[PDB]
Amino acid sequence: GSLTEDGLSYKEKFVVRSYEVGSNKTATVETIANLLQEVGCNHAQSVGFSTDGFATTTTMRKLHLIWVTARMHIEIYKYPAWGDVVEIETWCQSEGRIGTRRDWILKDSVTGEVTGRATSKWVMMNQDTRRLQKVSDDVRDEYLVFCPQEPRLAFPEENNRSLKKIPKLEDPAQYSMIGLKPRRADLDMNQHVNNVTYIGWVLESIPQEIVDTHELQVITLDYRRECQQDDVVDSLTTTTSNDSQFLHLLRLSGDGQEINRGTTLWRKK
Amino acid sequence: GSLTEDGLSYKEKFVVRSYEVGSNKTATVETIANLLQEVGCNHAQSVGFSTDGFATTTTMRKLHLIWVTARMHIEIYKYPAWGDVVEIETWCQSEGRIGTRRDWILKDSVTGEVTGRATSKWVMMNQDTRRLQKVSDDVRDEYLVFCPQEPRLAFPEENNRSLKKIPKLEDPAQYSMIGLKPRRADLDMNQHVNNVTYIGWVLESIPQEIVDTHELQVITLDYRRECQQDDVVDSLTTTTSDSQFLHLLRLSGDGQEINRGTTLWRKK
Ligand SMILES: Cc1cc2nc[nH]c2cc1C
Ligand SMILES: Cc1cc2nc[nH]c2cc1C
Ligand SMILES: Cc1cc2nc[nH]c2cc1C
Ligand SMILES: Cc1cc2nc[nH]c2cc1C
C-alpha cells in the first residue's frame, strides 16, 4: 500500500483468501470490514499517527484521548471472489468539532469498476472516563494537513442511507440469537472487542432462508456502548419491509442495556 | 505464491495485518493456522486439485471421498510481528494406506531464520457416511507425482512431540469455559466449522495469568468428531507440569468428545 500522489488519501490491494469467503465463494462483509480497518491503520502509520486503531497524536495521548467509531455504513455491489484482487482507497475529513469521518471506495483491480463503498463517523473520547468532548482547535489543526480541503464524499447523494436516524427495536423481536460471547480471537491488541465482531453478532439473527436466497447490499450500524470481554449479548432482528429490510438491536443479555442498533438491506439473488 | 523449482513444494509470503495480532503485537496462533490452511489451498490449486479444503481428485469426487484432518501439531519459536513478512513453505507426503501428511516451515523473510514449523495427519473419509476407508492404489498414484520421493520431514527428531499419544482428561477439570457456540464467521465455504475455531476453543480455558506471563510454544490437537453449526461446546484444561496443559473439547450436553490436545508454554 501507499499514499496517493497528493498525499491526501491511501491505496492498498488485497488478494481474497480461502478462509475469508462464505458459501457464495466471495468475501464476507466481515472480511471487507476487517480490510477497511486494516487500510485505515496503514494510512495512519504512513503519516505518523498511532497504529492501535485509535489514530491518535502525541497531544491526544498526553490527554488520554482516543477516536471511537460512532457509526459504520457499508454498501457492497459485488463481493470480491476468492483469489481476486480488490483495491481499497481511504481518506479522512473533519466534520467540525463533532468528530471526523473516514471514507472508503472498493474497486475491482482488473476492471477498475467500483464494487463497494463505506463511510464511518468517529468521535473523540477520554479513554478512562468514557466521556465525549468536542474536538479542540489544537487537535483539529494537527489533522487538517492530511485531509482534502474540499469536500470528498464516498456518499455524496442529497438524501442517502448513511445519514438516516435508526429507530429502537421494540419487543417482541421477530428473530433472535441469544447468549453470544466473544472469545480471545474477537479481541484486538488492546484487549477490546473488535468492531467487526458486532457486525457478525447483528447478522447472527438473520434467518437462514434470507441468507440462502438474498445477498447483503447495505448495513448501517450505530455503536452506543462497548461489550466487555466478560459480557453476554442478545442479537434481535425484525423485518421492516423484491428487497428485504431489517431493523437490528444488540443488547446485554442481563439488564438489556443497548450496545448497538442497525439496519440491513438484502436483494434477491 | 508459487511452486518451487522442482515442483514438489509451494512457497508464499504474507504481511501480518493489524487485526491478526494479539496483546504482544505479534500474530496469534489462530492467524498462523489460517495462513497454513491458505498456503495448503494454493498448493492444491497450483496442481489441479479441489480448492475447498478437501484437496480431492475427480476420482475421489465421484466416490464422494474427502481428506479430513486427524491431527494438527504446531511449534512456534517467534510469532511474526505486525507488518513483518513471513514466508511459508508447504509440502505433502503419503504415509501408506493410513493417510497423508502435510508439513510446513515458517521463516522470517528478512533474516531467513526458521521461526516455526507444523505437521498435520489427514485421513480419507466418505463425506456422507463419515466412514474412513483407507487409501486405494488408484488414488495414491494420482498424488505421488506431487510429493517428494525421499522422506522430507518438518519434524525429523526420532520420537518427537508430533507423534505422542494424547490421554483423555478426567473430571473434574482444573479450568473450564462452557457454552461455546460457533457463529457464521467460524464456518467455511462448505458451511462446516473451520478447523482453526477448535484451536481457539481449546485456548479459551487457559487462565488469563498464563496468557499474561507465558508465550505459547507448542500445540498438538487431535480431531475426533466435528462440531455442527447448532452444537454447543465445553472447553476443559488441566495443568500437567515451562507450563504444560492437557485439553478436552466435548459437546455441552451428552459429553461426546470432539477434540483432545496438549499445549506447552514458556515463561516470557
Ligand atoms: C454473516 C454474514 C456475512 C456476510 N457477508 C456477506 N453476506 C453475508 C451474509 C451473512 C449472513
Ligand atoms: C484520526 C485521523 C487519522 C488520519 N490518518 C490520516 N488522516 C487522518 C485524519 C484523522 C482525523
Ligand atoms: C487465544 C490465544 C492465541 C494465541 N496466539 C499466540 N499466543 C496465544 C495465546 C492465546 C490465549
Ligand atoms: C491431498 C493432497 C494435496 C496436494 N497438493 C499438493 N500435493 C498434494 C498431495 C496430497 C496428498
Side-chain angles (χ1 to χ4, degrees), chain B residues 28-180:
Chain B
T28 61
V29 77
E30 293 187 72
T31 286
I32 301 301
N34 275 320
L35 301 188
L36 305 176
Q37 68 186 12
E38 169 74 357
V39 80
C41 192
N42 292 334
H43 185 185
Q45 195 274 129
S46 75
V47 294
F49 296 129
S50 75
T51 62
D52 50 18
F54 306 129
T56 65
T57 59
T58 51
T59 305
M60 284 180 71
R61 298 162 199 165
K62 302 305 282 195
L63 294 165
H64 289 206
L65 301 166
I66 55 168
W67 287 108
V68 155
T69 307
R71 164 109 126 200
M72 173 67 59
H73 176 79
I74 308 176
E75 293 196 15
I76 305 293
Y77 311 124
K78 272 183 188 167
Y79 289 91
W82 170 67
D84 283 359
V85 182
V86 51
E87 187 177 56
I88 306 176
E89 178 177 18
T90 190
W91 70 94
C92 289
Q93 209 147 54
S94 297
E95 292 192 334
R97 332 263 292 196
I98 284 172
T100 59
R101 192 185 82 253
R102 171 165 297 271
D103 284 6
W104 298 259
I105 300 296
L106 291 92
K107 279 176 180 188
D108 179 304
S109 244
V110 180
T111 72
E113 93 182 285
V114 168
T115 61
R117 48 174 187 168
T119 188
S120 66
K121 307 277 203 205
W122 297 75
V123 295
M124 199 163 70
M125 182 187 276
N126 181 109
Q127 197 175 346
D128 305 314
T129 68
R130 272 71 206 272
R131 296 180 66 79
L132 301 190
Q133 160 69 354
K134 273 66 186 65
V135 193
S136 74
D137 285 7
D138 288 321
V139 165
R140 179 110 86 99
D141 294 326
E142 302 186 86
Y143 288 122
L144 294 168
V145 291
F146 307 103
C147 304
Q149 302 243 301
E150 302 165 74
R152 189 196 173 181
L153 314 165
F155 296 79
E157 315 85 14
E158 212 150 339
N159 291 266
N160 53 267
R161 309 172 160 139
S162 70
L163 311 164
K164 186 153 69 172
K165 156 118 281 289
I166 303 162
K168 197 181 178 167
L169 190 150
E170 297 170 336
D171 291 316
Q174 185 180 19
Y175 306 112
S176 70
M177 177 57 74
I178 70 167
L180 296 165

Side-chain angles (χ1 to χ4, degrees), chain A residues 91-109:
Chain A
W91 70 94
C92 289
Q93 274 211 299
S94 296
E95 292 193 334
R97 327 186 87 89
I98 283 171
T100 59
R101 193 184 83 254
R102 171 166 297 271
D103 284 6
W104 297 259
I105 300 295
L106 295 91
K107 279 177 181 188
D108 178 304
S109 245

Side-chain angles (χ1 to χ4, degrees), chain A residues 183, chain B residues 30 182 185-187 193-202 249:
Chain A
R183 62 187 172 88
Chain B
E30 293 187 72
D186 297 305
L187 313 176
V193 173
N194 179 169
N195 285 339
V196 178
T197 300
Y198 304 100
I199 295 173
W201 288 337
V202 161
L249 297 195

Side-chain angles (χ1 to χ4, degrees), chain A residues 228-253:
Chain A
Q228 253 68 43
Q229 200 189 150
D230 62 347
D231 276 334
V232 182
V233 166
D234 285 359
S235 176
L236 313 160
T237 298
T238 300
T239 307
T240 57
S241 44
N242 312 353
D243 286 2
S244 289
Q245 298 188 65
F246 301 86
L247 181 60
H248 302 285
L249 177 72
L250 298 194
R251 64 182 191 206
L252 293 188
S253 213

